[PDB]
Amino acid sequence: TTAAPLLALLRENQDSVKTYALESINNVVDQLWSEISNELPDIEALYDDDTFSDREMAALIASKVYYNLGEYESAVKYALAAKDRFDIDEKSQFVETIVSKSIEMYVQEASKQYTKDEQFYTKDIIDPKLTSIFERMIEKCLKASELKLALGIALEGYRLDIIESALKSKLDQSTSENVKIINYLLTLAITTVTNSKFRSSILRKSFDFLMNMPNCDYLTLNKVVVNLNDAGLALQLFKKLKEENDEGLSAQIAFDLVSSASQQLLEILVTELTAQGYDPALLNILSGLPTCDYYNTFLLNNKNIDIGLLNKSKSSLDGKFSLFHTAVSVANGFMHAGTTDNSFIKANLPWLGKAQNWAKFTATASLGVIHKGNLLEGKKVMAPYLPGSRASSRFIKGGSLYGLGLIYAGFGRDTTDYLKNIIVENSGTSGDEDVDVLLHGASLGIGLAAMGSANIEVYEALKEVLYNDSATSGEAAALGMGLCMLGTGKPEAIHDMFTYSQETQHGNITRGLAVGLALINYGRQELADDLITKMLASDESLLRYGGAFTIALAYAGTGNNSAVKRLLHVAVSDSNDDVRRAAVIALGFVLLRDYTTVPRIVQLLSKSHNAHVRCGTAFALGIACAGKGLQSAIDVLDPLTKDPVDFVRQAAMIALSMILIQQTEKLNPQVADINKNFLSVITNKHQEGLAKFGACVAQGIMNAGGRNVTIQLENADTGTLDTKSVVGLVMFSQFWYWFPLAHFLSLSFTPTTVIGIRGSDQAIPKFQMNCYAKEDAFSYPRMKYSSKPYKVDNMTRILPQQSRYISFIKDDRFVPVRKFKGNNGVVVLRDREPKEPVALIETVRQMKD
Amino acid sequence: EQKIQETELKIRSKTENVRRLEAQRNALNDKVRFIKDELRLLQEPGSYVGEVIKIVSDKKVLVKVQPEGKYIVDVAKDI
Amino acid sequence: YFKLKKLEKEYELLTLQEDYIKDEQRHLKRELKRAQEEV
Amino acid sequence: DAFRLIDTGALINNLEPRQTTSNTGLLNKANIQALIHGLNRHYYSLNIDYHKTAKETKMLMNLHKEQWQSGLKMYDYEEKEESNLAATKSMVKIAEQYSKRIEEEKELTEEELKTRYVGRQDPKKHLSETADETLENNIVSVLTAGVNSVAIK
């Protein structure tokens, strides 16, 4: 009925009569689409006709027919053909649908066209019909002051025109909203945009607006330099810092980037900045001279060892050979880290009597964490055990060379020349086992000193050690060369180290080379897929062990859906328990970004029958959940503690201490059960050696630095993430082979202190904010919004996470400026106008300065 | 949020589909683990049968085995 | 309104993570049935 | 089982628990269970692992994995059916009775919504026993049909 006969009249003559016929159809296009469905071939056949001028009204009819037919994409073509009868300003569900479909089709096409050309939005490469609605709707949202739809689609659509045009027009320069708008772009572009080049342009475009520093935020400019690692933009800020004359304006950039950039980019801020000019006051700051001196004085003032709980752990039994005396020494050195005090080595005579030549190495290595951070007297501590002073034996002499590595790591350029001379002397031949110990300890020391820095002398010196095929020092060669190849690395060293793995079949060399090939692939992402294929195809157990962490390091930081798919396939098809354990641990390093989905994945794998998978997912859960929230992951590790298997409980106790750090005293109700298990596992005679070692080290991690330091992993506050923390966490999976890799965890332990730090040199004042604070201030090991101000302010542990709720009063005369930051681990921030006769209180700290 | 709200149903749809398939895998994981745990019990040599005769303060009990002779054995630490 | 566009990428992540486990569990349950008939 | 002489295992000799899989002997059960901790002499710490090269890997896959089906193809399909011709017709009929006879015994315990015969493990007995029986019937149905199928005029 109605227009039904008018549909078949389109084949008659008198096209002028058809004009009045199509007008009556325009009313029923939204009513009955059934009769039109049979006439659709006739309606479209008249569109291409040159003598048919009604295509404007003809396209309007088919717009609401194919739409009601169930094809949304087809209705977009008819709506964009006429470009007349379609009303973009009409308010209806039909018009709003085509807009959503046309923009969605524009994103799918412009996604793959951004790689070929970035000018596509200025050219005809994309159909102008899709850009007609797309360009007008984004400009319509700009007039409505809506940045969600304008900036949200531009990031997904991969268009640089909207980002630049909108940000310039919305400038309020307040110096407030313009900073948040940029922050919304950097936060979403990392998770949404997969392309690293598109997000790289956003960092460069937003850099030109704030390059003059119109009272902007230093947090935004610091994320651009670290992420891009560009030498031009790194020194571009200092060029503006020279124009404006201020003592502390360059401090916030200097003190933040010294702990921000990796060893590669720090060389640009020191060596490359020297040629272009710098500030003599910032010479030591950018080189990290006071940075080491800061962390030494943080843990020295307040240190609570609580030997009452420590003595009961190591006095339980004198047996278990050196395994018992080593685990209690490693957990003890964590509490003395940076304070340069030895309770176990000095104050306790008898516990060193049963140590043999093999135990003296790990006992000496405990002092490396204790004295870590000493740039001057670190040699005087090991001086009797250093070469030239001989030693009680040549086995313990090698421990002094390894102790210098943990202390001087990354700053050891001075110690680098001393350690490589011993390697050359021992590279020719070795007739004794203790000779390799001196070569093993010196290689691990130079590897940490040159870690992150590419050095051709270290690669060539350790390469000759690999040719000797040593069963002791052969592992340190690949580990030392791998730390120098961090980052992009040398593509030639990838195939060279991989060839030596297939030639020499070893027990530690082949597994060590797999770790070295993983470190060089860190940050390469898809660039390492060539070597990953060779490891997955090989049937060697040691090559498959390092293939999982190769994916973990390359895909670290920003995650990948294909990286998780590859790791889950290895932990299933492969029957090797060590590879299944290594694959599930690699899952955490890829999932670091999103910690909410981590406990759900590892819990499904913890229900299987394999003990190594349950043990691997035990510590893999405590990695990303350590310095983050979501305390419900403890319930996932609860059934793993009751597992009678010895090594499953070891990795479970360590992961509990990482998540529960600073969670005591009315924060997590489960902290009461973990504090009892500290001495419950050791004193229990039914427990095994591996079970007692997991509970003993876990107690030392929570009490490390006098129960102060915490594990900071993936701090976005900076350019992205903390690199030195990931290095130690990958190592914890490898434990019982030769030496425990928990020693390298000290790189992830940093103190949280709020202290003045005058912009000139150093301050260490005494001041009290008298505002909100956590309850861990007075919390010490024994034998929301609180509305109540607290007098505990300067230094003194507590929680860096909840510091965002702290308020400020006058207190010190220097006063706050920018409302600070809220990150406790920065420990420096900025002081305003030093040299004020406020009668400042200072410490000594003259030994290392 | 037209596309966000429309695709929200796919979140609850795929979530309820995968969780209900995990219970079948978790059941198979419990069956294989149970059979594996019961395998080492059958491989165990087992135990004899006997009757308690007399006990002393030395934690040594005299158990009379029917096929074999009488043997004085030490009691377990759990009892 | 910031969580609306932020969780938009998380919607695709939650879908893929559930699909990857669903694809790997088919190969895992095959080895589970082989161990049951082997005992 | 191998053996390694520890000589004097009293004090400060060498550390066995390093290489691989040590500190065994949980409770009184170790191997035969009579050795427990001390094993033979001063805890020789038994560890044994195997290995395979490139030639030994392809050899075992082409020879013995579970059973040897290689070297000939269509005989293993036919001979299994030919020897079972009188058996398959029998086994389908014999197992047909025992399939329902189990279903006609334990399943009758659970009938109404309330408790009648007090079924406990009975509904789970006939489910697990007949789970493979229904699977084996579908396997032999394809094998009997598949061998006679696939061309051969």
3D architecture notes:
The structure is cut from a larger assembly and holds chains A (849 residues), B (79 residues), C (39 residues) and D (153 residues). Chain A is an all-alpha fold and 849 residues long. Helix content of chain A is 57%, strand content 0%. Chain A is built from 41 helices and two strands. Chain A has a two-stranded antiparallel ribbon. Chain A is globular and about 115 Å long. The termini of chain A are far apart. Helices cover 52% and strands 22% of the residues of chain B. A three-stranded antiparallel beta sheet of chain B has the order 1-2-3, with no helix packed on it. Chain B is rod-shaped and about 85 Å long. With 153 residues, chain D is mostly helical. Chain D is built from five helices and no strands. Chain D has helices spanning 54-63, 74-83, 85-103, 122-129, 131-148. The radius of gyration of chain D is 28 Å and the shape is flat. Chains B and C meet through α2 of B and α1 of C. Chain C: Belongs to the AAA ATPase family. Chain C: It comes from Saccharomyces cerevisiae (strain ATCC 204508 / S288c).
Overall radius of gyration of chain B:
28 Å
Can you count the helices of chain D?
Answer: 5
Tally of strands of chain D: 0
Largest interface summary: B-C, 21 and 19 residues
Secondary-structure element series of chain D: HHHHH
Q: What general form of chain B does the structure show?
A: rod-shaped
**SSE pattern of chain B:** HHEEE
**Helix content percent band of chain D:** 40-55%
Task: Give, in spatial order, the strands making up the sheet with the most strands of chain B.
Answer: 1-2-3
What is the structural class of chain D? mainly alpha
N- and C-termini, Cα separation of chain D: 58 Å
Largest sheet of chain D: none
Q: Sheet bearing the most strands of chain B, described?
A: 3 strands, antiparallel
Beta-strand content estimate of chain D: under 5%
Quaternary state of the chains: part of a larger assembly
User: What is the helix fraction of residues of chain B, given as a range?
Assistant: 40-55%
- Overall geometry of chain D: flat
Q: Structural class of the helices, strands and pairings of chain B? A: alpha+beta
Q: What's the Cα radius of gyration of chain D?
A: 28 Å
| Count of discrete alpha- or pi-helical segments spanning 4 or more residues of chain B | 2
Tell me the strand percentage band of chain B.
15-25%
Subcellular location (chain B): Cytoplasm; Nucleus
Subunit structure (chain B): May form a homodimer or a heterodimer with a related family member. Interacts with OLA1, TMA17, and UBR1.
Organism (chain B): Saccharomyces cerevisiae (strain ATCC 204508 / S288c) (Baker's yeast)
Function (chain B): The 26S proteasome is involved in the ATP-dependent degradation of ubiquitinated proteins. The regulatory (or ATPase) complex confers ATP dependency and substrate specificity to the 26S complex.
